[PDB]
Amino acid sequence: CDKEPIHIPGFVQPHGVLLAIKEPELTILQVSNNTYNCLGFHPEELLNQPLRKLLESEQIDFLNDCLTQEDIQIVNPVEFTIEPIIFDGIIHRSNGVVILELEPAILFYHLVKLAIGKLQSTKTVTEISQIIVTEVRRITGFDRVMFYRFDRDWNGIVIAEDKQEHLPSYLDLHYPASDIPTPARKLYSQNWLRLIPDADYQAAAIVPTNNPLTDEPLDLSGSVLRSVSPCHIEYLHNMGVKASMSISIIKNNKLWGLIACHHQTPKYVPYEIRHACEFLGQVTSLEIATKEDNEDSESKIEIKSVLAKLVEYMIDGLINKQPNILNLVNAQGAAICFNKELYLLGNTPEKQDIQNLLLWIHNNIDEDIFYTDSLSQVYPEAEKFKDVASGLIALSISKTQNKYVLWFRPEEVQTVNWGGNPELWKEIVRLKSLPWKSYEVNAAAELRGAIITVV
Amino acid sequence: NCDKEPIHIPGFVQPHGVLLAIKEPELTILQVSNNTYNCLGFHPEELLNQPLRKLLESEQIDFLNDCLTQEDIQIVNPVEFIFDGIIHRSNGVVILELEPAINYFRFYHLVKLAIGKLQSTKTVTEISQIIVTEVRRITGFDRVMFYRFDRDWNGIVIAEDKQEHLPSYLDLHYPASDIPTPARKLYSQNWLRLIPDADYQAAAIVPTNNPLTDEPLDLSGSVLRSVSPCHIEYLHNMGVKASMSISIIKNNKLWGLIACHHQTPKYVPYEIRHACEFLGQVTSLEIATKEDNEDSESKIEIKSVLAKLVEYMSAEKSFIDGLINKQPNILNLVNAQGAAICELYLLGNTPEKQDIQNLLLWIHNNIDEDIFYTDSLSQVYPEAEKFKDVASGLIALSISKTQNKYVLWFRPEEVQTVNWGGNELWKEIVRLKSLPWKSYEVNAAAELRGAIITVVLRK
Numbered sequence: 054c055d056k057e058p059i060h061i062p063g064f065v066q067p068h069g070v071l072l073a074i075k076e077p078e079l080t081i082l083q084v085s086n087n088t089y090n091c092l093g094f095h096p097e098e099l100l101n102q103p104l105r106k107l108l109e110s111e112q113i114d115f116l117n118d119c120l121t122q123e124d125i126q127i128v129n130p131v132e133f134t135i136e137p138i139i140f141d142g143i144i145h146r147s148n149g150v151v152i153l154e155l156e157p158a159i160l161f162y163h164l165v166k167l168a169i170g171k172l173q174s175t176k177t178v179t180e181i182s183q184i185i186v187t188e189v190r191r192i193t194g195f196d197r198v199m200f201y202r203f204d205r206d207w208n209g210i211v212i213a214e215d216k217q218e219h220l221p222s223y224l225d226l227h228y229p230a231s232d233i234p235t236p237a238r239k240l241y242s243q244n245w246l247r248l249i250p251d252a253d254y255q256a257a258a259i260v261p262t263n264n265p266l267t268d269e270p271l272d273l274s275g276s277v278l279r280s281v282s283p284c285h286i287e288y289l290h291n292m293g294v295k296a297s298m299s300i301s302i303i304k305n306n307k308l309w310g311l312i313a314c315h316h317q318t319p320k321y322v323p324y325e326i327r328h329a330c331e332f333l334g335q336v337t338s339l340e341i342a343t344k345e346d347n348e349d350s351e352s353k354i355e356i357k358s359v360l361a362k363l364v365e366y367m368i369d370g371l372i373n374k375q376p377n378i379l380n381l382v383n384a385q386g387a388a389i390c391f392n393k394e395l396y397l398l399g400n401t402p403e404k405q406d407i408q409n410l411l412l413w414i415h416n417n418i419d420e421d422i423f424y425t426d427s428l429s430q431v432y433p434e435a436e437k438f439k440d441v442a443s444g445l446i447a448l449s450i451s452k453t454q455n456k457y458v459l460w461f462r463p464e465e466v467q468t469v470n471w472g473g474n475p476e477l478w479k480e481i482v483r484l485k486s487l488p489w490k491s492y493e494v495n496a497a498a499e500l501r502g503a504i505i506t507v508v
Numbered sequence: 509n510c511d512k513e514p515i516h517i518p519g520f521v522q523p524h525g526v527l528l529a530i531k532e533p534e535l536t537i538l539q540v541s542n543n544t545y546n547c548l549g550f551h552p553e554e555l556l557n558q559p560l561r562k563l564l565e566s567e568q569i570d571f572l573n574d575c576l577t578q579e580d581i582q583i584v585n586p587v588e589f590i591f592d593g594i595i596h597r598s599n600g601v602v603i604l605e606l607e608p609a610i611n612y613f614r615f616y617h618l619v620k621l622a623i624g625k626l627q628s629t630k631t632v633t634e635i636s637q638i639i640v641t642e643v644r645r646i647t648g649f650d651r652v653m654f655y656r657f658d659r660d661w662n663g664i665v666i667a668e669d670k671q672e673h674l675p676s677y678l679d680l681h682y683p684a685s686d687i688p689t690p691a692r693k694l695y696s697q698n699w700l701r702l703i704p705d706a707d708y709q710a711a712a713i714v715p716t717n718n719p720l721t722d723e724p725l726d727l728s729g730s731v732l733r734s735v736s737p738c739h740i741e742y743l744h745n746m747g748v749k750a751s752m753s754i755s756i757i758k759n760n761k762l763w764g765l766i767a768c769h770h771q772t773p774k775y776v777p778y779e780i781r782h783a784c785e786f787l788g789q790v791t792s793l794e795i796a797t798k799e800d801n802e803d804s805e806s807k808i809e810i811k812s813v814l815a816k817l818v819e820y821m822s823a824e825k826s827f828i829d830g831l832i833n834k835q836p837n838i839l840n841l842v843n844a845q846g847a848a849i850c851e852l853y854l855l856g857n858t859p860e861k862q863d864i865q866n867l868l869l870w871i872h873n874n875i876d877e878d879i880f881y882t883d884s885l886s887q888v889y890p891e892a893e894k895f896k897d898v899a900s901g902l903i904a905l906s907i908s909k910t911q912n913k914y915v916l917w918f919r920p921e922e923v924q925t926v927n928w929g930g931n932e933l934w935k936e937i938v939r940l941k942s943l944p945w946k947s948y949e950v951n952a953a954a955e956l957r958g959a960i961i962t963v964v965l966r967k
């Protein structure tokens with residue numbers, strides 16, 4: 054599945070025409086199969102003929118001036134005419150042979166400028182998600198538009214949705230990482246927009262399948278007409294999705310998420326709308342990456358500040374004054390266990406249970422800092438106090454002196470709603486606290502030296 | 509003072525257009541610019557609490573209602589009433605601005621080519637030169653300058669495309685006083701601004717207050733809004749009789765301005781205006797992407813330097829020998845040219861012994877923080893003037909304030925020659941001051957203190 058090269062299917066979607074054209078002669082090296090019905094010329098009539106076979110010398114002068122540019126895509130939304138049939142066209146190099154793609158014409162900043170400032174006023178990522186799904190639905194008119202964030206395991210989840218009122222909601226449904234394989238994620242990373250105008254499309258083959266000069270298969274990663282994987286066309290047929298459009302939300306040059314637009318009737322997206330939506334991806338990708346670092350750096354500076362108030366306080370100021378020890382790592386409870394002395398704070402396991410956990414940590418843990426979001430899986434007795442200390446951060450200030458600090462977090466029962474995973478599927482996570490942030494555990498490890506310093 | 513001027517409600521508008529403040533949804537023309545009688549054939553008193561239908565054809569107000577049904581009217585701008593109309597709701601009454609209506613295939617083609625050239629850039633300076641060149645090629649203004657703002661809100665001409673004979677204002681800093689806070693906010697709201705004729709006589713709106721609510725007409729969204737007198741006096745002072753500006757915006761803050769200037773009067777059509785405004789939006793997103801990626805690269809390499817330093821401290825008998833002798837060393841962490849780990853251990857271009865000893869004396873006697881930094885050590889410690897050549901910028905890292913365990917970084921003085929346009933030329937020499945410390949460098953210094961204490965307590 055991840056081994057399958059979707060980027061070189063050897064086929065294209067019927068609605069457009071593909072022409073791999075070598076340069077400088079502009080000889081037509083490769084064509085699709087729908088070159089006849091769409092362009093009139095039969096596929097054998099076009100092969101190895103120079104591009105002047107179907108284009109005017111003035112349009113060819115235009116295309117050659119486009120070839121002079123450092124990147125041809127600066128001119129990309131080209132308009133050619135070939136019965137004065139009109140075609141929007143896409144130009145891009147791949148394996149040297151310039152791919153040209155023709156989609157028939159339909160007879161833009163105002164559409165986006167509302168959305169740009171509407172995104173500029175956002176505060177949280179979820180606001181960006183809801184605003185962008187609503188705006189993409191209003192611009193496109195798709196029956197369904199879902200913002201779909203990837204997680205640390207590259208699982209999907211419908212973080213936002215805007216749909217037909219009669220359609221079922223897929224909100225906050227998780228999907229397995231298998232549903233979007235690695236080659237698909239790479240093509241989404243390299244393509245701002247992906248389009249499947251009709252799920253019932255009969256693929257037209259690229260004849261010859263290989264480039265006549267190089268024998269290499271034609272690379273179609275940047276091709277807007279690239280054939281869909283049947284493994285996904287069958288999935289669209291299962292859902293009734295006769296039209297599909299994905300906008301790749303990218304952050305740190307990697308696929309932060311997707312915006313999927315499913316339409317029950319088959320739907321062709323005008324280039325002026327594709328320009329409006331592909332531009333909206335750059336705005337959403339920037340507003341998300343900017344809002345995310347603000348929530349993280351402000352969280353990181355805040356954890357750094359409460360440690361500073363703790364250091365100036367100093368056992369006295371750790372458990373007493375307003376920025377207390379459990380504020381440092383956002384714990385629910387805490388226990389300072391110095392020798393036979395025990396200082397509880399917040400909600401903690403009873404003193405016998407804490408002494409048992411301390412004997413366990415003295416036997417097992419061999420590091421100054423140890424942390425888990427589910428203590429029950431390593432210290433099974435913790436199941437009795439899962440509701441006060443499902444999560445633990447042990448800070449062994451001194452192994453020989455029996456000096457420990459134990460942060461405690463309550464169980465966080467999670468109800469993960471999958472669309473199947475190896476129909477609806479609830480997954481009930483339990484004995485698991487809210488996971489520790491990395492900076493919280495780093496501040497907890499730093500607190501050991503901050504405690505030793507005040508001797 | 510100048511920062512407390514309500515420029516958004518002059519009560520007047522630029523003569524070249526006609527403003528009509530109409531109350532929704534009756535299309536009742538509550539307010540008109542006084543110049544209606546000349547360019548419209550209708551006296552200002554003829555359209556007061558009158559329906560808009562008396563002035564516009566019913567075939568055109570039928571489209572206007574379909575525009576008003578939308579959540580945002582601006583999608584329909586410019587309406588074709590021969591006049592170009594701009595509709596935008598503001599302060600109750602919707603505003604209808606009418607301008608005379610002035611093929612153009614090369615214009616849109618080079619517009620998209622300019623958008624692609626902006627997307628092909630890799631540094632902010634390339635975006636600056638490209639956007640000024642393209643806006644000049646699109647508009648024909650005699651002068652086009654990119655005007656980046658300072659953290660002190662000083663301007664600076666970072667890019668310029670001007671006439672061959674015109675003076676170059678490049679690199680000239682300008683005082684923040686030139687752009688008062690309300691003007692900065694209005695430029696943060698209105699993305700494009702035009703004064704077609706600096707010598708214009710303002711057209712008053714009758715009534716000045718809203719007839720139904722005794723409120724000023726909020727011209728903040730108006731494209732015909734009259735300029736404040738001070739800006740027009742400056743336009744007379746340097747003789748540019750027509751101006752355009754494109755707001756560059758990042759994080760909802762005015763990151764800069766693309767100032768256009770013309771010796772002759774110029775009347776930019778709404779099509780070229782909207783194209784330049786979209787180019788400014790593209791330039792804003794591109795500059796934000798470049799700056800964020802550059803900050804991410806510098807932060808990642810600084811974290812890698814810190815990780816290598818921690819690995820050296822964990823793989824050497826004394827951590828000072830892993831911080832100094834090994835490469836990357838402690839200088840790589842904060843981009844310093846000198847260092848001194850206090851005993852004492854020098855590294856690189858540092859003040860000589862007894863000079864650094866006096867610096868540690870002043871540090872123990874005065875500084876009262878875990879970490880301290882300044883780009884001009886001499887102005888808080890005069891003795892540093894004797895060694896400003898090697899240590900004008902300092903980072904004092906208080907590993908242990910009590911027993912005097914310190915780490916100091918040093919930067920040489922970098923003399924700056926700030927060529928000001930005002931308090932004509934006003935060159936200002938800045939000395940006794942090193943290059944400014946970047947915030948991530950100070951963060952790396954504090955993280956180095958924490959990692960040093962951790963590896964020390966490992967012993």
Ligand SMILES: C=CC1=C(C)/C(=C/c2[nH]c(Cc3[nH]c(/C=C4\NC(=O)C(C)=C4C=C)c(C)c3CCC(=O)O)c(CCC(=O)O)c2C)NC1=O
Pocket residue numbers: 054055059228229231232233234237247280281282284285288292297298299313314472
């Ligand atoms: C309710 C459940 C549910 C799931 C799981 C789901 C997954 C899923 N699979 C794909 C495409 C999707 N899926 C696959 C491949 C596979 N995927 C597989 O599960 C297997 C076995 C293969 C094949 C080996 C590919 C290669 C692509 C990308 C195709 C393209 O965009 O051209 C998308 C993107 C759809 C679009 O952009 O139009 C989604 C959301 N959608 C849903 O609604």
Ligand SMILES: C=CC1=C(C)/C(=C/c2[nH]c(Cc3[nH]c(/C=C4\NC(=O)C(C)=C4C=C)c(C)c3CCC(=O)O)c(CCC(=O)O)c2C)NC1=O
Pocket residue numbers: 510515682685686687688691701703735736738739742743746748751752753767769
């Ligand atoms: C020779 C070069 C040159 C300079 C330096 C210049 C100044 C200048 N001052 C302002 C803002 C600027 N400046 C002021 C005000 C003031 N101005 C003052 O000198 C004082 C003392 C005040 C305050 C009382 C205002 C009110 C505005 C905003 C005007 C507006 O758009 O409403 C702009 C941006 C306005 C626009 O986009 O047209 C410019 C270009 N224009 C030029 O052509």
